[PDB]
């Protein structure tokens, strides 16, 4: 059989706010999440991250728990407001915030794991939110993040050497500050852009940061984590055509034009106008170019419609369900998402073709429909997650050793189940099974499904 490269990298992601817990505990201060999560209506259950998985205090066993996985990187983000509470560039940094990250790295790296580190993955400083506004103000943003972004590289620099600065911008302004279903729960036909524009930049800034006083000392590689679906158009008319051009440029191209080309795609400057803000000569040549590697988050595919009413998506309609009434795939616990192997195949290709940066798939990854439901004894025979992998390893492996895309990382997500934002505890992503009354873990056998098929597809 076919095989990659050994030099590729597997292994899983998750999110601080997602599975830590301990909100509070050793100097942490609130994120704009926590204050979400007692906001009446905005998570489904009513839950919040303030125990999640527990694993601010189980990160022992959760890094033993990888290492019996026999993966070779894990993917995981820190909790801004562990390391500097309020935020801010002349705010008390918190050693003792710093110390539990310091300590998780140096045990993935004494068990020969290799970290892969999210400076972002939407748990900004409640401080900054109330002091500024957050993303909302350029210049305090970018200063803050920047500083942020030095005090990481300085702190556990030596040991990392793949680094990721934001997790989905574009969730980040469209959620968070569009129609609001996101901390910190703004609705706006702005400040979505705003934002947008705002994390490029303090992107790029944090980029040019590490690449002139960290990277040559610390041998290590930065780039941004973009979200996409594949996207396929309707029908074969103009407009449905047109239609899936723009969609792609409302989700990936404003990030991924500015980053990998120099500027923002056509389409949006047209339709936002003076509501989408313009680079100046210097910012253009900061931000053209500005990340290592092209990292990727993926879950499905779409068909796209012209003659869509909301102006975030693109006006454009999206769906799974062909004109013949045909799905896409198997159904997940959420509608959106349908298993659809084929796509991630095309969009990897994609993606190598038009943005010439090595991929790094930072997550990947489905929800059994009505696993919450389940017990455990029942939850670990996970076959539709088990078909997810198989259809998607086997797009990988396809990608790259016969395609020819150049795609260097898998992370699985996730480890564990855990909180997942809006949805709260009932929609299940990990391989890994949680008992949230026992914290007990209990593999699923796609864990086991993935340990053995990247063993058999990695060169020796």
Known sequence: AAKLPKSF??????????????????????????????????????????????????????????????????????????????????????????????????????????????????????????????????????????????????????????????????????????????????????????????????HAHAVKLYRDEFKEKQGGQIGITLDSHWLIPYDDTDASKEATLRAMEFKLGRFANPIYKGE??????????????????????????????????????????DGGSDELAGFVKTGHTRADGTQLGTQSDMGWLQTYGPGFRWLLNYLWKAYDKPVYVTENGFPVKGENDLPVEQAVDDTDRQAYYRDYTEALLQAVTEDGADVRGYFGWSLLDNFEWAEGYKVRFGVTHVDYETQKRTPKKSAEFLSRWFKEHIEE
């Open 9 to 202: 990298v597997w292994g899983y992601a998750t999110a601080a706010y997602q599975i830590e817990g301990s909100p509070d505990k050793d100097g942490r201060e609130p994120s704009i999440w926590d204050t979400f999560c007692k906001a009446p209506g905005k998570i489904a259950d009513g839950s919040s991250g303030d125990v999640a998985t527990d694993s601010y205090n189980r990160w022992r066993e959760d890094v033993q728990l990888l290492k019996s996985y026999g993966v070779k990187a894990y993917r995981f983000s820190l909790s801004w407001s562990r390391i500097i509470p309020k935020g801010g560039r002349s705010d008390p940094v918190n050693g003792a915030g710093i110390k539990h990250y310091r300590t998780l790295i140096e045990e993935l790296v004494k068990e020969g794991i290799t970290p892969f580190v999210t400076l972002y993955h939407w748990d900004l400083p409640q401080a900054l939110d109330d002091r500024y506004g957050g993303w909302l103000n350029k210049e305090e943003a970018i200063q803050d993040f920047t500083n942020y972004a030095k005090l990481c590289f300085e702190s556990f620099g030596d040991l990392v050497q793949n680094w990721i600065t934001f997790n989905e911008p574009w969730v980040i302004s469209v959620m968070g500050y569009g129609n609001g279903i996101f901390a910190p729960g703004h609705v706006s036909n702005t400040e979505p852009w705003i934002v947008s524009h705002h994390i490029i930049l303090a």
């Open 264 to 305: 923002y795609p056509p389409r949006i400057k047209k339709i936002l106008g003076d509501r989408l803000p313009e680079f100046t000569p210097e910012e253009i040549e900061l931000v053209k170019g500005s990340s290592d590697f092209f990292g990727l988050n993926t879950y499905t595919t779409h068909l796209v419609q």
